[PDB]
Design an enzyme around this catalytic site. Structure first.
Site, PDB file in Angstrom:
ATOM      1  N   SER A   1      11.057 -10.257  -3.940  1.00  0.00           N
ATOM      2  CA  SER A   1      10.721 -11.722  -3.952  1.00  0.00           C
ATOM      3  C   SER A   1      10.252 -12.113  -5.353  1.00  0.00           C
ATOM      4  O   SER A   1       9.447 -11.381  -5.992  1.00  0.00           O
ATOM      5  CB  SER A   1       9.568 -12.113  -2.963  1.00  0.00           C
ATOM      6  OG  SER A   1       9.988 -11.862  -1.642  1.00  0.00           O
TER       7      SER A   1
ATOM      8  N   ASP B   1      -2.278  -1.520  -1.988  1.00  0.00           N
ATOM      9  CA  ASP B   1      -2.499  -0.495  -0.973  1.00  0.00           C
ATOM     10  C   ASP B   1      -3.670  -0.924  -0.080  1.00  0.00           C
ATOM     11  O   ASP B   1      -4.800  -0.619  -0.461  1.00  0.00           O
ATOM     12  CB  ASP B   1      -2.890   0.752  -1.744  1.00  0.00           C
ATOM     13  CG  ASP B   1      -2.945   1.905  -0.808  1.00  0.00           C
ATOM     14  OD1 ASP B   1      -3.018   1.579   0.370  1.00  0.00           O
ATOM     15  OD2 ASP B   1      -2.961   3.088  -1.062  1.00  0.00           O
TER      16      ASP B   1
ATOM     17  N   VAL C   1      -3.607  -0.109   3.233  1.00  0.00           N
ATOM     18  CA  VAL C   1      -3.428   0.695   4.429  1.00  0.00           C
ATOM     19  C   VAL C   1      -3.820   2.128   4.222  1.00  0.00           C
ATOM     20  O   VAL C   1      -3.046   2.610   3.396  1.00  0.00           O
ATOM     21  CB  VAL C   1      -1.994   0.665   5.036  1.00  0.00           C
ATOM     22  CG1 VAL C   1      -1.960   1.551   6.290  1.00  0.00           C
ATOM     23  CG2 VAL C   1      -1.717  -0.771   5.453  1.00  0.00           C
ATOM     24  N   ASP C   2      -4.610   2.879   4.914  1.00  0.00           N
ATOM     25  CA  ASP C   2      -4.803   4.298   4.741  1.00  0.00           C
ATOM     26  C   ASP C   2      -4.729   4.925   6.171  1.00  0.00           C
ATOM     27  O   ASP C   2      -4.948   4.255   7.205  1.00  0.00           O
ATOM     28  CB  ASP C   2      -6.175   4.759   4.173  1.00  0.00           C
ATOM     29  CG  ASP C   2      -6.587   4.189   2.848  1.00  0.00           C
ATOM     30  OD1 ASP C   2      -5.744   3.882   1.996  1.00  0.00           O
ATOM     31  OD2 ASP C   2      -7.726   3.957   2.393  1.00  0.00           O
TER      32      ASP C   2
ATOM     33  N   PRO D   1      -6.036   7.330  -2.601  1.00  0.00           N
ATOM     34  CA  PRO D   1      -5.437   6.383  -1.672  1.00  0.00           C
ATOM     35  C   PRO D   1      -4.004   6.703  -1.390  1.00  0.00           C
ATOM     36  O   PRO D   1      -3.457   6.057  -0.493  1.00  0.00           O
ATOM     37  CB  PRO D   1      -5.592   4.969  -2.293  1.00  0.00           C
ATOM     38  CG  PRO D   1      -5.701   5.320  -3.764  1.00  0.00           C
ATOM     39  CD  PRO D   1      -6.329   6.717  -3.907  1.00  0.00           C
TER      40      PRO D   1
ATOM     41  N   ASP E   1       0.958   2.781  -1.328  1.00  0.00           N
ATOM     42  CA  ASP E   1       1.179   4.220  -1.433  1.00  0.00           C
ATOM     43  C   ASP E   1       2.585   4.653  -0.986  1.00  0.00           C
ATOM     44  O   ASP E   1       2.850   5.825  -1.070  1.00  0.00           O
ATOM     45  CB  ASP E   1       0.088   4.918  -0.568  1.00  0.00           C
ATOM     46  CG  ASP E   1       0.310   4.596   0.884  1.00  0.00           C
ATOM     47  OD1 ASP E   1       1.408   4.629   1.457  1.00  0.00           O
ATOM     48  OD2 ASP E   1      -0.618   4.328   1.660  1.00  0.00           O
TER      49      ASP E   1
HETATM   50  C1  LIG Z   1       7.833  -3.044   2.433  1.00  0.00           C
HETATM   51  C2  LIG Z   1       8.937  -4.055   2.847  1.00  0.00           C
HETATM   52  C3  LIG Z   1       9.331  -3.694   4.295  1.00  0.00           C
HETATM   53  C4  LIG Z   1      10.147  -4.115   1.887  1.00  0.00           C
HETATM   54  C5  LIG Z   1      10.381  -2.817   1.101  1.00  0.00           C
HETATM   55  O1  LIG Z   1      10.358  -2.724  -0.088  1.00  0.00           O
HETATM   56  O2  LIG Z   1      10.579  -1.790   1.977  1.00  0.00           O
HETATM   57  N1  LIG Z   1       9.839  -5.236   1.050  1.00  0.00           N
HETATM   58  C6  LIG Z   1      10.562  -6.394   0.738  1.00  0.00           C
HETATM   59  O3  LIG Z   1      11.743  -6.648   0.772  1.00  0.00           O
HETATM   60  C7  LIG Z   1       9.307  -7.194   0.463  1.00  0.00           C
HETATM   61  N2  LIG Z   1       9.296  -8.449   1.159  1.00  0.00           N
HETATM   62  C8  LIG Z   1       9.062  -9.635   0.548  1.00  0.00           C
HETATM   63  O4  LIG Z   1       8.795  -9.882  -0.626  1.00  0.00           O
HETATM   64  C9  LIG Z   1       9.112 -10.832   1.498  1.00  0.00           C
HETATM   65  C10 LIG Z   1       7.848 -11.667   1.330  1.00  0.00           C
HETATM   66  C11 LIG Z   1       6.703 -11.295   2.036  1.00  0.00           C
HETATM   67  C12 LIG Z   1       5.523 -12.036   1.981  1.00  0.00           C
HETATM   68  C13 LIG Z   1       5.523 -13.214   1.227  1.00  0.00           C
HETATM   69  C14 LIG Z   1       6.674 -13.620   0.535  1.00  0.00           C
HETATM   70  C15 LIG Z   1       7.819 -12.818   0.556  1.00  0.00           C
HETATM   71  C16 LIG Z   1       8.591  -5.972   1.069  1.00  0.00           C
HETATM   72  S1  LIG Z   1       8.266  -5.755   2.837  1.00  0.00           S
HETATM   73  O5  LIG Z   1       9.227  -6.724   3.414  1.00  0.00           O
HETATM   74 CA   LIG Z   2      -3.237   4.166   1.335  1.00  0.00          CA
END
Ligand SMILES: CC1(C)[C@H](C(=O)O)N2C(=O)[C@@H](NC(=O)Cc3ccccc3)[C@H]2[S@H]1O
Ligand SMILES: [Ca+2]
EC number: 3.5.1.11
Lengths: 207, 557
Positions: free
Chosen positions: B1, B73, B75-76, B205, B252
């Site tokens: 994003s 991070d 979450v732990d 972490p 993490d």
């Molecule tokens: C951890 C995720 C499952 C995934 C990843 O890298 O595995 N991410 C996105 O695509 C990114 N998502 C966004 O940027 C979408 C977003 C979320 C909150 C506010 C604005 C945009 C993150 S999570 O989806």
């Molecule tokens: Ca963590």
């Protein structure tokens, strides 16, 4: 007056709600959502509460179990019960508006029910505050702000220490998954400020 | 994003410009929902995912806001100590404590229902149990207990009229999310919002902590610690899921890193190119970044260095000259299906070969497969989300930086060989692979372009429409699922704020019982493809002058 809600849709169909109090503002928003996106919202509801297999069958059992195992619904419920009356009116008004349009859909399904309902073989039920909140909680929180791979990390560090020894294993873990990297491009430039905390980077919780 | 906010000192013909490109993947009907709310203290316009009460993307005539995923991070995992004598208990602060639990029954269409139990400790729900080591893992979120406060903060923030009222609400949003602010006076701002745990000293972490008590979080860190900036000296705020601030630690996840190779640099290059940007130039950043191969910039120098002594007829050398002559921008040929230049396939095959020879080889199986992806992996439906630099390519970028890199190379990824030799061997593989598929004449190579798909299954993999409602676009674009732009105090208009967006396929997902699709079911699909956008109205007179229909309801609570 107090009861009046005006909905105006622009040339791309985008709705603008006019109302005089919180419940009525959010009621108009839930109403127009129910008009535009009922089937998507029904399916996002089932996705966020793990009730997909109820309409789609066995291929979604595992997914529904994984959603229910990832949250504690009563806690969300207890957070909604602690809201002030103004804040609860945002979620109640939204559920009640949707319900107003859903009630019209199931009274005249022959012209108003989204076709997808007929394709997948079921009809929409009313919504409550918890359901509106879970659309948000089940997407933004329980999916987009919930990422950890710590058990896999520990299995990687274990294999690294088995291949390279304890110290080199841990320094190779710090080469592949560094805690911080000073050359990372940061949204805030270093001259503005830097994060003041320093973290352990040798797994000393189990030292 | 991504997001780029341009403040007073960088904007042209305006005091501020915010352009947001939140990337959640592409769906039919639209991931986001356009909505304007007027009354009860609100006056806002924009669009927002799943029609949440709070608009994530929009403005109120005084300020504008937007988000990108935080990836802090928050979450732990706690390793709970179990006992075979007392099933359902765990040890915490010296006592055997009873796990909370609940039964759930999954009802199944045309199948048998299944009942299972969910367990939870003081640290969160149990993820998995190792009965062999009497250990249960509980997943602890720093925002636990604040999910509803977070939805409300995203809704109340739409009433803020200045930085201080807005950060008071940023402070109550507990998930890991970057929020951005711009206002009519040309002030701009950013806050990496969320709840982050105050961990005990010694707590790494990235890995699990004992759940017996001594490693429990001391509480949450205060808002004063959240990374934030208001009116930065650079005049701009740019983000593409990159680090918020020097020394701030990433999520993490093993496959996620903030390092010297970051795709946000492609936005920086475009904003720094010219002293100031107009709103059209700022919107044009979407088009350029969406077509920008992200590895060219990183690896072209190493490729030019490894091939610089080679003869003109060496093919290793001719692959790198083809890259040298390219700006990394992909463009379709007239067939609607191959790219004009072969550079991305060259970089993909080279990179895949480099990772196999370097990082992959240093990591024990089966973890080696986590570092083998080049970042170009896709289906014939095209990428399911944004494209990024892969985790292995970010690690290889440190190694090829040598002692320019701050990361100690504990293991030489080139294993004692000269880097040039490894680069050149990967180039030999690339020539062989690609010349076998397309011939020896690089200039007629018509490599396949990635395509884009608005899927009928939502991001969870669950149908949110019939499969024939899937929509298809020839040109994959590494951009927001939606794009929105707000301009503040334009010098070319008297309005304090102008704003645009694009919500494709359309505002409406409704299909009547007889199959007749809504008039607004697909009228933003071509606009999306061509980098177009439509006006977002805020004021009563603008809305009424662009009115298509209206309804008045009379309701009693
Ligand atoms: C951890 C995720 C499952 C995934 C990843 O890298 O595995 N991410 C996105 O695509 C990114 N998502 C966004 O940027 C979408 C977003 C979320 C909150 C506010 C604005 C945009 C993150 S999570 O989806
Ligand atoms: Ca963590």
């Amino acid at each position: 007056s107090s009861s009046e809600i005006k909905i105006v849709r622009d040339e791309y169909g985008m709705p603008h709600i006019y109302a005089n109090d919180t419940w009525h503002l959010f009621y108009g928003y839930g109403y127009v959502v129910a008009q535009d996106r009922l089937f998507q919202m029904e399916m996002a509801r089932r996705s966020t509460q793990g009730t997909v297999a109820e309409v789609l069958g066995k291929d979604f059992v595992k997914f529904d179990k994984d959603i229910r195992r990832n949250y504690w619904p009563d806690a969300i419920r207890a957070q909604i019960a602690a809201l002030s009356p103004e804040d609860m009116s945002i979620l109640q008004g939204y559920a009640d508006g949707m319900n107003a349009w859903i009630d019209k859909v199931n009274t005249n399904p022959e012209t108003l029910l989204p076709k997808q309902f007929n394709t997948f073989g079921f009809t929409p039920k009313r919504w409550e505050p918890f359901d509106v909140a879970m659309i948000f909680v089940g997407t933004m929180a329980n999916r987009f702000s919930d990422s950890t791979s710590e058990i896999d990390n520990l299995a990687l560090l274990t294999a690294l220490k088995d291949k390279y020894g304890v110290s080199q294993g841990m320094a190779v873990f710090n080469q592949l998954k560094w805690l911080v990297n000073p050359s990372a491009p940061t949204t805030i430039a270093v001259q503005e400020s830097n994060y003041p905390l320093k973290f352990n980077q040798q797994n000393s919780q189990t030292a | 994003s991504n997001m780029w906010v341009i403040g007073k000192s960088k904007a042209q013909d305006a005091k501020a410009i915010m352009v947001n490109g939140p990337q959640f993947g592409w769906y039919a009907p639209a991931y986001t929902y356009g909505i304007g709310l007027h009354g009860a203290g609100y006056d806002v316009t924009g669009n927002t995912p799943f029609a949440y009460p709070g608009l994530v993307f929009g403005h109120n005539g005084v300020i504008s806001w937007g988000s990108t995923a935080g990836f802090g991070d928050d979450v732990d995992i706690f390793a709970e100590r179990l006992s075979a004598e007392k099933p359902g208990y765990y040890l915490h602060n010296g006592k055997w404590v009873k796990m909370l639990s609940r039964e759930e029954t999954i009802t199944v269409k045309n199948g048998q229902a299944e009942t299972f139990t969910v367990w939870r400790t003081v640290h969160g729900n149990i993820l998995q149990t190792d009965q062999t080591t009497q250990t249960a893992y509980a997943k602890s979120r720093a925002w636990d207990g604040k999910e509803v406060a977070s939805l409300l903060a995203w809704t109340h923030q739409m009433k803020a009229k200045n930085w201080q009222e807005w950060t008071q609400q940023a402070a109550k949003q507990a998930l890991t999310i970057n929020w951005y602010y711009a206002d009519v006076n040309g002030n701009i701002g950013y806050v990496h919002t969320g709840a982050y745990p105050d961990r005990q000293s010694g707590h790494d972490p990235r890995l699990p902590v004992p759940g017996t008590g001594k490693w429990d979080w001391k509480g949450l860190l205060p808002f004063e610690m959240n990374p934030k900036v208001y009116n930065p000296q650079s005049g701009y705020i740019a983000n593409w899921a990159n680090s918020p601030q020097k020394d701030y630690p990433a999520s993490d996840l093993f496959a996620f890193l903030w390092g010297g190779a970051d795709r946000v640099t492609e936005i920086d290059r475009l904003l720094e190119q010219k002293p100031r940007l107009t709103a059209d130039q700022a919107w044009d950043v979407i088009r350029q970044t969406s077509r920008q191969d992200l590895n060219l910039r990183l690896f072209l120098p190493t490729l030019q260095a490894a091939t610089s002594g080679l003869t003109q007829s060496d093919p290793r050398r001719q692959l790198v000259e083809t890259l040298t002559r390219w700006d990394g921008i992909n463009l379709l040929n007239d067939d609607g299906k191959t790219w004009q230049q072969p550079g991305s396939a060259i970089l993909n095959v080279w990179l895949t070969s480099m990772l196999k020879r370097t990082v992959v080889a240093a990591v024990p199986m089966p973890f080696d497969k986590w570092y083998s992806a080049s970042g170009y992996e896709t289906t014939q439906d095209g990428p399911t989300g944004s494209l990024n630099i892969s985790v292995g390519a970010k690690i290889l970028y440190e190694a090829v930086q040598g002692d320019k890199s701050p990361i100690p190379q504990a293991v030489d990824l080139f294993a004692g060989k000269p880097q040039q030799e490894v680069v050149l061997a990967a180039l030999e593989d690339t020539w062989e692979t690609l010349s076998k598929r397309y011939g020896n004449n690089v200039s007629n190579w018509k490599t396949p372009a990635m395509a884009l798909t608005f899927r009928a299954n939502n991001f969870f993999g669950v149908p949110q429409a019939a499969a024939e409602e899937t929509r298809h676009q020839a040109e994959y674009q590494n951009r927001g699922t939606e794009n929105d732009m707000i301009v503040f105090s334009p010098t070319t208009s008297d309005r304090p704020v102008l704003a645009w967006d694009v919500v494709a396929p359309g505002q409406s997902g409704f299909i009547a019982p007889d199959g007749t699709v809504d008039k607004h079911y697909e009228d933003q699909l071509k606009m999306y493809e061509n980098f177009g956008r439509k006006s977002l109205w805020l004021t009563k007179q603008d809305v009424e002058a662009h009115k298509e229909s209206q309804e008045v309801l009379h309701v009693q609570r």
